Amino acid sequence: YGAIYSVSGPVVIAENMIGCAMYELVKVGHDNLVGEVIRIDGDKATIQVYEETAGLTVGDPVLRTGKPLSVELGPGLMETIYDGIQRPLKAIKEESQSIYIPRGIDTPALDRTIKWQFTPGKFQVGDHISGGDIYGSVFENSLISSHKILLPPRSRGTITWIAPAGEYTLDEKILEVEFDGKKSDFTLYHTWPVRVPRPVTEKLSADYPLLTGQRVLDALFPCVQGGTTCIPGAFGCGKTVISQSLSKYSNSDAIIYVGCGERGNEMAEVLMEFPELYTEMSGTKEPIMKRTTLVANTSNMPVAAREASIYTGITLAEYFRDQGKNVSMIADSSSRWAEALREISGRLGEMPADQGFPAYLGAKLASFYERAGKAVALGSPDRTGSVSIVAAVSPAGGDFSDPVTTATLGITQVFWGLDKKLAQRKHFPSINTSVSYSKYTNVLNKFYDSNYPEFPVLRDRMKEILSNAEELEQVVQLVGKSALSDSDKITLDVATLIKEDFLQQNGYSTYDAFCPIWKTFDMMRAFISYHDEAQKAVANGANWSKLADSTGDVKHAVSSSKFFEPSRGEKEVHGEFEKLLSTMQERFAESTD
C-alpha cells in the first residue's frame, strides 16, 4: 500500500497513505517495527516508531492494520514490568536478549500462555449490558481479588453466551454480546486506545485523604486521593527517593509507576527494590511488585514510548479507577515527555511557539491532568473509584520560567515548594511556606471535622512561624545580630525543631514506613504548645534564658520524638504525646515562675 518516502532519525514518513486516521498504528518497512501515525501532512503521514530504526530503507512497504494503536486491558498487568508502548520486557529480556526496547521484534503486552480463574457475576442470558459493566471477575494476585473483568466502553447489547466458572486463558471466549446482529466475540483481554481517555458516568468531589508517608508533604499541604499535585525538581536532588519512597510508602489498592524521561538506573533499582521490600497490607510472594504496575521508559529508548507511556499509565489508572479501586499514579518526569514532544516537533518540522517547545505541548500537558481525578465508576454497577495524579516536574530552562512548570502550574490544584539552597545543603525533601497552594483543604476540612483532626490548625501556625522565621533569619543575617525580641528567637527555635523534625526525611528518621494522621496532627501540637507556652510565658513576664533553661528535656524529647513509632501505648497515639501534655503545664509553670 504505502511506500517509505523519507527516513530521518527515529521517525519514518510514509507517502501514499489515504484513508488512515490520526491514531491508527501500522508496521513500517519490512522488519515489522511497531509504530503509530500521530500526525499527517497531505498524502504523506508521519509515523513515530517505538524502536530505533537503523537498517530501514526508503520505499519499503507500509501496511496499516486498520485499527487504532493502544494497549490490552486484562488480568496479568500486576507483578510485571513493561515499557511505555505496552511491551513486556521480561519475555524480551530472555527471548530477544535485551532488557531494553528491541528493534525488529514484536511481542504482545498480554501473554496467551498465562491462565487465570474466571468467575461469572449475577448476570444471566437475556440481560442488557453497557460499557464498563461488571461482567465477571478474575483473581490476578493472592492479596487483592477486586480485578473484575469488564467490557470495553462504548459497547452495548445482550448477553447471548455466558461461560461458567473455571480456569481459562486470555484467548478463550467467555462471553458474547450482540445488540443488532452478531457484532463480535469477547475475551479476557480488551482493546482500548491509549490516546483516547476512558469515559466515566459523572465526576465526584475530592474528599478522601491519602497519606504518602511524608510528614512534611502532608503537613505542608493536604494530600487527597483524587487531586492533582506537582513535585519540583532541580536536575537531581533526591526526587527519585521521594517517588520510590512515596510509592512504596503508599497503601493504595493500585500503583501506577510510569517513567517518562528517567535514565534507567532508577527504574531498575525501583523494580528490584519492590520484591525485597514489604508492604503495609500483610503481603507475601512479592507483595510490592504484585500490588503496583511497573512501566519502565528510559531516555535511551524512542520518544514514542516515552510520550505514549503517560497515555498508557493514564489509561491503566482509568481502568483501575473504573474497576472500583483507588490507585495512585506516580510519574517522573514531565520534562522528559515535554522534551520528547519538542524533539518530535523539531524532528517532524513543526514550528514551535514556546521558546523552543511545541505549541501543542500545553494543550496535551493540560489535557493529561484533567483525566485524573475521583468520580463515580463507569458502568451499570456504579462502583466507587479514585485516581491520584502525582507528576513531578523537572527543569527545562529557567528555575520557574519553564513552559512545562508554567503550563502545568495552572492546570494543577495542589502545589508544593522546594528550597533551592536547602536542597543543596542535604535537607531534602524541603518545601517553601511562601510558595504553596491547595484547594482541597476546605472540602477536606469538612470530613476532618467529622474525623476530629487538628492538622490544619497546627499547619497554619507552623506555616506562619516558618514564614516569619525566614524574615527573621534574613533580617538578622542582613541587619546584623545586635538586638532582638524573645518572640523571634522562640519562633526561630520552634522553626528549627519543626524544620528538623518535619524537613528532615528520607534518611534522617528511624520510622518513615508509615505516618498516621493522629501522629502528624498530635506531633505539631507539642511544638505549637511549646511556642505558644514560650510566647505566653515571655508575654506575661519572664526571661529568655529562664524559659529555654526551663524547658530542658522537653525540647530534646520533642525533637527526638520523631524517631519513636506510634505503636507505643495505643494503636494510633504514642505515650510521649500524652506525657508531653502533662509535662508542658509543669514546664510552662516552672518557666514562668
Binding site: 529557567g398 528555575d399 520557574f400 520560567s401 533580617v475 542582613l478 541587619v479
Partner: protein, 45 residues
C-alpha cells in the same frame, strides 16, 4: 558569567533585600545620630 535564562529572579529579591537593609541601616543610623546629638550635648553640659 551569570545565567542568561531566568537569572533576574534572584537579583530582584537580592536587590529588594539590599534596599530594605539599606533603609533599615539608614533609619538606625538616623536614630543613632539623633540620640548621639542629645548625648553629646548632655555629655557637654
Amino acid at each position: 558569567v551569570f545565567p542568561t535564562r531566568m537569572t533576574l529572579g534572584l537579583m530582584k529579591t537580592k536587590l529588594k533585600g539590599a534596599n530594605q537593609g539599606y533603609s533599615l541601616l539608614k533609619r538606625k543610623s538616623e536614630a543613632l545620630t539623633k540620640r548621639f546629638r542629645d548625648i553629646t550635648k548632655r555629655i557637654d553640659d
